[PDB]
Amino acid sequence: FQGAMSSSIDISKINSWNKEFQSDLTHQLATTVLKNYNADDALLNKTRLQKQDNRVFNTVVSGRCWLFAATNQLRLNVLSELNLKEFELSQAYLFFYDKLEKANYFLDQIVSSADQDIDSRLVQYLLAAPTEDGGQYSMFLNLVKKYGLIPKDLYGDLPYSTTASRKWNSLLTTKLREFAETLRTALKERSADDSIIVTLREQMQREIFRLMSLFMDIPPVQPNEQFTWEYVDKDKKIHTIKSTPLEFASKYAKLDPSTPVSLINDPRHPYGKLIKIDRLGNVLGGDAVIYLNVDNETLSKLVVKRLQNNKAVFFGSHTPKFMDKKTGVMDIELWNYPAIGYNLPQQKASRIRYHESLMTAAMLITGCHVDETSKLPLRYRVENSWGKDSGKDGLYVMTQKYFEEYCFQIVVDINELPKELASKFTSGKEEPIVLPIWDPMGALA
Amino acid sequence: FQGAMSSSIDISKINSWNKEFQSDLTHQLATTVLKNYNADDALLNKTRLQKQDNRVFNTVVSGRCWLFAATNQLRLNVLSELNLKEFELSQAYLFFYDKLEKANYFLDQIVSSADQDIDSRLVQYLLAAPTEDGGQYSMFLNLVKKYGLIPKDLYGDLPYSTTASRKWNSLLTTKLREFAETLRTALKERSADDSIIVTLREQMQREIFRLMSLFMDIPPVQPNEQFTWEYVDKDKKIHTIKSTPLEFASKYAKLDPSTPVSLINDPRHPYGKLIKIDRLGNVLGGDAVIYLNVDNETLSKLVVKRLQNNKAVFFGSHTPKFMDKKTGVMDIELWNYPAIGYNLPQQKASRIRYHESLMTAAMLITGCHVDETSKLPLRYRVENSWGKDSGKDGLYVMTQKYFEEYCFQIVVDINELPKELASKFTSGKEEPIVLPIWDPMGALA
Amino acid sequence: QAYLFFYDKLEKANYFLDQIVSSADQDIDSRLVQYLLAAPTEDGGQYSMFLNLVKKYGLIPKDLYGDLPYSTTASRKWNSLLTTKLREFAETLRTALKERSADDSIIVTLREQMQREIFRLMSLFMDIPPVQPNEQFTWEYVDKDKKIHTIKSTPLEFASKYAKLDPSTPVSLINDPRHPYGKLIKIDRLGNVLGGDAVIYLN
């Protein structure tokens, strides 16, 4: 009894506390202002903004954020290779196959977890959001290795659902939840390899494809089928390229799928270890989401090194934590929360464990400023798919502390790594730390 | 030298003070918020608003603010007398003649001050804004005594300039400034009664009228000329009234111009004295702006008494000081300026002398709440011409302290006064305190 | 409605601290602890959570406590700020519970400091209501005929004498075909006021 009483909200206590707080001048001002405006709007610190909103970067390179971020370098490679003024790869092309493959992958996840109760943690998680739009770099390579890439000119963002996919996803998900029950019900009486189950699964793939084809057309050419693409170079001369999507991704966009690797700063785990997310994927049998865990000093140096190689860096962060979209500044001290006594001592590893921080989006680091001493990076230039309308004409500036605290993953080429880190990936000796499918270091918008 | 140095802004001093202020938590919060939002928006105190925004009034009555306020009672009288559902008097009618008479009055003010230098304080003041839209209750009676009143149905707010008079006023004023020079130049060689001056003045009246007639039509009937007005009573029956504007103001609108008197709380001066504003007027030879100075206890009692007689009270205040248009609350403590250490100890008389407070507008008190004890008024219900769009569906609530501090004038009927106050007006023994034409207790919008 | 909304949030934040202490024996990544950490101060409720509040706090006219504050109509930011703090507090509690018993004076003190910080933060976004549940308020109003009246009552008396709520009469029925009809169904742990009634339905 005494404990439950002490654990209860006591009306005398809260009214006594209220009297004490009302006697403090800062509190009086704070409650007046914060009953009038959104706290971020009220506390944005223009004195701090004035100093941090610095767009000089001494180290720079010459729509589903994850697809824009993963494809931008390849878009630039073509632009370069064909001497074009402007050029875009088709993000819709990858989006269509990503959804189809994920829906298909879900059927396989349901069959492989059919031994678990319907209310088990994994089966419920699988049923929660099987066809969402997010991905990861390995999920992007899985798609490009099977489907290749094509110019946006041949398959654009025309359909309603390419820019407002919520309804389409909900309709496909409702059907997938129906199918999971049909599969699980059929698996009680049979083995998965039973011809009846195999037939059921094919009919489901067919229904998924039929439904998807109502909202988007299947791309115009198969991966090994040639397309013809007519274009104008920066000088106004016309050309015609005949290529297949797979040849295009290699010959013109110069993607070598064997070079990219992901590094992450996940302080919940030992540095130097590989970390693998169980079950997270899109294409059945494709590669896993795997990261090499490293400290922030290492992560920061690799970003600078990649930038010096003249290549942008795909990174995963907790958007929009401490991100001001109007000014395009990512700074954890941009808002004066300490002035209302609101401080956050929880450290990175614990923020992750305690459901406070996770990866939510992919963006690109396209530049940075290394201190004009023999030194370190102070801030990064960041670009994303939102448009010149967001940020400062589309550009964001991120502080080194933001990168250390609210960013996690970067993608670099294996050749840019020190031999002892590169060997973590090449010498099949490493045993990864395997995390659940629902881990916060997962899919990115 | 030492004095001039001490009187200068010293850079070390201000930067030292800045360091001290930045060490205070309240100041840190305040400068963060106030660089983001308008101070009134940031400091509006919703805790105070919650208590003061009380629309229960136990003492209630059953477009140029000054014309709306002066004419509303008369509008109600007709509504009553003719059993109408709705009815409006023509404010445009009075507005047209007010402007014409003021322009004419200005010519007379210029002739009477022709002995003073062009850069004298009075001549420059006369030239500053001779045809503005504001008035006073005595300026309203001056017009009704000469022109009468008519239904808005016969002369409405149709012309552009009735609702956006700035351009028209500027064009008329530019011409009046030209005319002042022509008159003053002619008066150097002649007496004012010289036939040449008399002729000049008539030509100016003619040009003023011509110009005014371009922006508004002269009313359709003369003051002693009959108009015919067809209308529908609240029961849908039709009637026709034949009356002249002067008869209409008396027979139907029941205005007895000999009953209204103005009282004012102007603590710069002794209470019990009449106060007269020199030269302020509209119709040449019309009555002066005269007030009887009284303390706030007396002023407050008279408002309550008039309300009990079921009549609204025309009053003059410093709009929009401490007035929140969105919630329609007039309360001098509604904004938490003390929370940023902003306090105003200057008292009423000094606010007036020091150019801080003055009468700027006329509105109507239509109700009040007298404390349910044998007591005093706590708040007033206020209405004005801005529309149901302003305030709370058009209604404002004003605190007793606001009335005491930022209101000044009320208009009551002489019969509502105590005999010793009424005698101030009736026994030609009182010598008024005469104030300059530019006094702050003047014209009202 | 704001009156109930304020106390609902305060009580739920408090309830969350108790849920964390009672599940401290489970791993941080367990299904329940992660669920508790997902959205501890959201705006939703249930009829039993409403009776729990009215039985403790009563009801008052909106005239005395309206929807004036920003957060009463756009609560997302306020909830996010309170939740970030609650996730910090869950770790502080769980870390302290490894070395101590829950009834340890150090834990009791920690919990009270957390209640205080939760209340402080809430008071920045909404004022605590103007009167306590058993404290009288004065309410002036106008009836449909334009006559004025003044009622003197407390929030608890108001909910009974004027709003006529008898908290012992309401019951919830549900059609949940996952389960046999005629059975009571209870949702484990779902609540707002610590020790208040459970969410129970008759199928």
Curated annotation (Swiss-Prot), chains A, B:
Give one GO term, molecular function aspect. single-stranded DNA binding
User: What are the protein's UniProt keywords?
Assistant: Cytoplasm, DNA-binding, Hydrolase, Mitochondrion, Protease, Thiol protease, Transit peptide
Gene Ontology biological process: homocysteine catabolic process; negative regulation of transcription by RNA polymerase II; proteolysis; response to antibiotic; response to toxic substance
Give EC number(s), comma-separated: 3.4.22.40
> Record's superkingdom?
Eukaryota
For this protein, the activity regulation entry reads:
Inhibited by E64, a specific inhibitor of cysteine proteases, N-ethylmaleimide, iodacetamide, and mercury and zinc ions.
Q: How is it modified after translation?
A: The N-terminus of isoform Cytoplasmic is blocked.
Gene3D superfamilies in the cross-refs: Cysteine proteinases
Q: PROSITE patterns, alphabetically?
A: THIOL_PROTEASE_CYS (PS00139), THIOL_PROTEASE_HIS (PS00639)
**Enzyme class, UniProt record, top EC level:** hydrolase
pH dependence (UniProt free text): Optimum pH is 7.5.
An additional note in the Swiss-Prot or TrEMBL entry is: Present with 521 molecules/cell in log phase SD medium.
Q: What does this protein do?
A: The normal physiological role of the enzyme is unknown, but it is not essential for the viability of yeast cells. Has aminopeptidase activity, shortening substrate peptides sequentially by 1 amino acid. Has bleomycin hydrolase activity, which can protect the cell from the toxic effects of bleomycin. Has homocysteine-thiolactonase activity, protecting the cell against homocysteine toxicity. Acts as a repressor in the GAL4 regulatory system, but this does not require either the peptidase or nucleic acid-binding activities.
Q: What is this protein called?
A: Cysteine proteinase 1, mitochondrial
- Taxonomic placement: Eukaryota, Fungi, Dikarya, Ascomycota, Saccharomycotina
